[PDB]
Chain A
């Protein structure tokens, strides 16, 4: 299974 990184917020929409 492809490694899932804990959600970090990138530029908001």
Chain B
């Protein structure tokens, strides 16, 4: 359901982000 390396994680400020672990980049918007 969630692509390998892609993680849905939140920051303690209440902001959710998708982190791609292979490219190790922070993505805010859903790439679809």
Q: Which of A's residues lie within 8 Å of B, judged by CB? A: 2, 4-5, 7, 9-10, 12-13
Shortest CB-to-CB span from B30 to chain A, Å, is 14
Interface SS, A side? loop
Interface SS, B side? loop
Contacts of B25 in A (CB 8 A): 7
Q: Are B28 and A7 in contact (CB under 8 A)?
A: no
Contacts of B21 in A (CB 8 A): 12-13
The answer, among B5, B7, B15, for a CB contact under 8 Å with A2, is: B15
- Sample of 12 more A-B contacts, CB < 8 Å, known A5-B26, A7-B25: A2-B15, A2-B28, A4-B28, A5-B11, A7-B19, A7-B24, A10-B9, A10-B19, A12-B21, A13-B5, A13-B7, A13-B21
